Design a protein around this ligand. Sequence first.
Ligand code: SF4
Ligand code: SF4
Ligand code: FES
Ligand SMILES: [Zn+2]
Lengths: 114, 118, 687, 198, 231, 47, 83, 83
Amino acid sequence: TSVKPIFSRDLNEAKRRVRELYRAWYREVPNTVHLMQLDITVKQGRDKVREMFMKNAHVTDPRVVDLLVIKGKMELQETIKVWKQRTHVMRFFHETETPRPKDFLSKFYMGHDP
Amino acid sequence: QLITVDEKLDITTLTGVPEEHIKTRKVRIFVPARNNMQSGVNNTKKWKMEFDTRERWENPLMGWASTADPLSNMVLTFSAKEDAIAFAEKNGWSYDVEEKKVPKPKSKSYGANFSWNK
Amino acid sequence: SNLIEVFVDGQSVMVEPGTTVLQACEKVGMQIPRFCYHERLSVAGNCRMCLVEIEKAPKVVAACAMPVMKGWNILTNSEKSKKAREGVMEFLLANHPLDCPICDQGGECDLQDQSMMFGSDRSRFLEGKRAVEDKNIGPLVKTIMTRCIQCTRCIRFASEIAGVDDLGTTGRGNDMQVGTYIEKMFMSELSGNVIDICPVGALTSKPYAFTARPWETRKTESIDVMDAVGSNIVVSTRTGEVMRILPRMHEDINEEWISDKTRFAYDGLKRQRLTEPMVRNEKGLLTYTSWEDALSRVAGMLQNFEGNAVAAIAGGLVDAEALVALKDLLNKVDSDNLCTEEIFPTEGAGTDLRSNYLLNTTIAGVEEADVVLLVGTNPRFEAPLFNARIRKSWLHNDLKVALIGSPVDLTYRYDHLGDSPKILQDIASGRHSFCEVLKDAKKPMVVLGSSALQRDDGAAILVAVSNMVQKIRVTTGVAAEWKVMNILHRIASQVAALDLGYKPGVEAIRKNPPKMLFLLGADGGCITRQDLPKDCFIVYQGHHGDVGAPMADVILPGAAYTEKSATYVNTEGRAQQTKVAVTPPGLAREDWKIIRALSEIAGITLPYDTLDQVRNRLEEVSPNLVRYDDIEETNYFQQASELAKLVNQEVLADPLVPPQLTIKDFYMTDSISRASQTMAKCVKAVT
Amino acid sequence: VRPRSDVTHKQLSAFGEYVAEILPKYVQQVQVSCLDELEICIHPDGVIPTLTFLRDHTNAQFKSLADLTAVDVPTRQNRFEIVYNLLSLRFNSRIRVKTYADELTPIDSIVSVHIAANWYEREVWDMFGVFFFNHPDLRRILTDYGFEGHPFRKDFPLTGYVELRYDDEVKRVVAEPVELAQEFRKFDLNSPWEAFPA
Amino acid sequence: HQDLPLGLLDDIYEFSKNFSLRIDEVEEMLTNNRIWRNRTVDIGVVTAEDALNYGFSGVMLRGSGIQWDLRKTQPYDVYDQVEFDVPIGSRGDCYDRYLCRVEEMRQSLRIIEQCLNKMPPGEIKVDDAKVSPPKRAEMKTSMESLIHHFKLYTEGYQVPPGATYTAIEAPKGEFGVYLVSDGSSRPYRCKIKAPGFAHLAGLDKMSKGHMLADVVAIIGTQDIVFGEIDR
Amino acid sequence: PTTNPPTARKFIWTNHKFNVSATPEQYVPYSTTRKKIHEWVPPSTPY
Amino acid sequence: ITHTGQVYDEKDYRRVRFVDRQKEVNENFAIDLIAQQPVNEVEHRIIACDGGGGALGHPKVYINLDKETKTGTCGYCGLQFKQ
Amino acid sequence: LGLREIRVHLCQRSPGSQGVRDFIVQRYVELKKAHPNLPILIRECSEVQPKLWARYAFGQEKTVSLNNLSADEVTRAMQNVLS
Ligand code: SF4
Ligand code: SF4
Ligand code: FES
Ligand SMILES: [Zn+2]
């Protein structure tokens, strides 16, 4: 315990920042899908944003959250100030890779080490 | 002023590891033994934690070994058992520590070999 | 008290009187460069590469052989003690043949490194070198002895750790060659250890001659499954196939040594190995097919057959995790006919108290014993690293060994009470002579081998021994934590199987024949297809096609202990974990999953889906399985005897004889062993 | 055997004491290697203060920042060891000030003290993940635009987790989990025998 | 690694003898052309204190008049026994920096001359077999040498634990390696300070109030090779 | 080579070849190591 | 075929690699080429095989030709010598 | 309810287990003599309170905690299991 605060004194204040970033991404998804001529649906993309913002829903510690948005903000900057081209963005969608089943029987049938 | 958190530093969310290799990878914290070939003990000093071994299929074109597991060759070295356990907890990898086993003291004396009755 | 204070470079370490100068440096942490000194071998002083300089003393002293004295300062790194090493290393290297790119102890050399660290950078030996004729000491150890630094650790081990007393020094001068005077092979178990103990690469392993080089070898620490001592071992794997298995030290179980079987039968692990799941075709031959098809062949028969029509004869090297996955499956179709090939008498308390079937005096308790009553087993060939235990405790301590079996080569002086199971009654009556010898023993131990139990009167033999242990305990008045009765096994999956409540012996399957049989790694002839019902629908679950495969309607290949994170337990119940050194070959899969998957294809689906879960399962059925490296202290011998007293059986006059009478008996036993080309070469060498 | 002048090991040693005395609130340890190099060690809070004193003190002018780096000792609670190497063109001497930073306990930025650090601090964030407060524009410099994970951390696999190939179906470059055709052979090289007391 | 072949120093003399005319020739073709001067003079001026603050440390440091050469200030190797003049420029425009680079080529011919004139007879690698590998004949006739060759090639020097930042005047500027070393034969960290990571940072400040074309000159006058910057 | 002819060692080629890459004579890489895990072949005799 | 009996099975598909191409092998096989060289009949118990050419050869080693039955063979050249 | 096995996972030297172990010492033999086929398993857990696991027919397992229970309560609970 006894940790020093990075930018947010408590999960509460930190959550404020997450809200802002969500908004940012939400407002940006449409633009990217147009400035990058990505073949995705704005709605679809906006769900992806939600996915990511929740993939890390479990974090309880304020410090971890604060870094997470710093990093998140940095990603947005790379996508609104466009330095990240389609190949970079579409990677988020994991479009080419073949999905792996998580069913035990499925894995048994395919991989030595699951 | 400092803030209070009872949450075990877990930073699995910042490390940047693919989900599959954080929830399916068991690492073992062990002090390396000595290949019996040599009698030196300088490689049995520091604790090491090593990730579980994974597929090593033969390559069809040249017959070279091929591996799909990124964390295979990685063995991190930690000076003390407590510190290594900490690394597993904050990185979220499962751990199964093995106690160091050091040679027990053995009593030796050249005189014995010339014992009246051994 | 008894704590001198000696200074190692002024560190005031304190050591028991008797500690050598080398030992004093060790506790500070310094390591005297040493050759010819091994911790578990007698001090010889041959190399003199350990010369150190006690302060204010005219000459340098021999570390490994000098009793430390009060006040001495070791000056291990003194300019002098470096000339005393810069000048010895000059000599060892002078007559040495520089074939380091032949010497497969390339990176495993305690003489290059001790030369690269403690010796000089050049040479002044402008004279000629020597050469010593090589020797065909055996089919396992390649003695390119022109390499030998005459350090006499072999002659010690071959006399002190193993009782061979064959290797010896021959001649004097610079042509002292340490090889057998007449060419007689060094045939003994414990033989391969010489390789590991010769720091020079003079004699090294012949199978692992030139397959690798040590820096490359990835080293995974695992457990010996060939024998029930459960010796710790390190499996050295390169690019995914095992290259060598060499010992790793466990004070209590194998203290730096491993058997000849469990280090040259890694070759057997690579052939005759099952990989794809074949099924019996209409034509009547096993045809390779995908899991889905092979599994539902088995699942469909399983759903059709009810309890007591499905049975499992497990046995040999199967892990505890598969053993609980096979029991949980067959109970979900209500047959508890799960059984093991090795029959442990189960008419009184068997499998219920966990001391009827364990060597509960620890492997390290053979060191503090007083009289051992070996009854009906050849330890030399059933538990080689426990025979060594009684070897060390008969030499360094004073164990009085007595054998009631065949008079057999035991590497020590035993007393052959006789070859008759009924003379056990003779001692119980106090009639036989050794009855007093034990009376005189303050800490005695009986050891009943599993192979004596495998005869028909095994139930009677266990009961007869328990009676004698009872009055031995009463007459000696031995303390409770000292435990006289223990029984040693020779099958790795026997203590685990009995632990999970598997009932020993195929006697139950014999009385009612199952329509279905899961042979989980069983290559024994305990039941045969002629014996089975007409349907004879049995499915082999194992790694090597030996006896169970060609008489199998389904083949579900599994793995071996080099290829799975399974658990095993040796004879005094110390559970231990094998780690995956190499991924399992072909479509072959881990034993526990095949059975979890077959269950999902059957509709009773075992609750565990990840190893950690199969383990949690082991915890509910049994304690040892989850706590590793931890022998279980308390036992309930007194209630065991009460039930033994209720049991009435006749010990037949037929002498009790260990199946492994001589060493050719020993080399090929289990599946991996049988499949060994190295073991086969060893077998013909003996024959 | 290299020639060693003790003039320096004395000069530098003295300076070390001088710095320590002047900045006792932050200097924890000040050592001179056997290689005649000083290495004041400061509490992370002393980043701004200790540097500034060295950049602007008549008796210790350390105008240029040679380098900012972060070794990662995983065992150490504070994983990273930010090391700042500075040069004094006036006194022809270099000093190194090294602090400790854990993964989520950021260090102050010295872009104010030396603008050279604007880039190196971005380099330390990208590779090791330490964060620098008050940095003008902290953002990945060396790694790919979408890279996930900090690469020079000792806990990051060399080959990494993603590799790129061109896929026709999608007519665009596409990451896939790394599949290597000859894994890095991990030769074990440490010898079981030590060399000297050190 | 190996001794100079027996004809190299004569051939280096013949190259150095005639090389200066070759510098003289581009000297005439690109040093007074009004077109070069206009393209290079008064472009990317960097003030002296700003150059030290941005960690420029190179011809960029010397071009604005700061007098710093790690070859004379902190003499590494033998740079204490060779005589040369650091070509300090005065004003800092990309011309003064060019002129400095042309002078250093000339000053290096002065240092190369001294090295050919005064190269000592001797061995090319330290005689400690523990650090430098044993000679081919010795490893094939003496056991101590084969053991030392085998261990050095297979395992390594095993340098004593410590850390050092060593800077030499690489042509671009100060090139330094911060090598942190555990007692192991393989390093623990090796931070390559690249004269170039600092210089490229300066591009935004140096290329201020400048055209698209000036930026092409600004990168050119930093002598930036992206291998050093990217590492 | 005419003045000081080279050393002949009764294995060295007499017809040396140019780049055979586009022509069928080209190296096609192959593992030269033999099989490692021999398998249990099923009994061909019906039980 | 090759030095080590490396012959792709009649059903292996790496044989497709050799389709329309030459599987590179060398007619000159060492196992045989060393045999041709005759046993050197030295007259000293221990002789040395420097490898031929000294520094241009292999590490120097001394062979004990004492065993009357067999002949010493340099672990390097394979050259055999008998007393 | 077909009873197949009863597992008494006592924990040695544990305060609560005292009752369980006492049962083993005084009445185990008797129970076995009575039910001479049923397998009663005496096993030794650790840092866990004692559990009388019982396996009924067709792979159903049931749990009765024996933590801090007297010797006869352990006897009564065991007797309730094999009805
Ligand atoms: S033993 Fe083998 S390796 Fe060690 S030195 Fe002699 S030859 Fe070289
Ligand atoms: S053989 Fe190995 S052990 Fe026996 S003497 Fe020669 S060197 Fe010492
Ligand atoms: S170890 Fe001291 S005599 Fe060999
Ligand atoms: Zn030769």
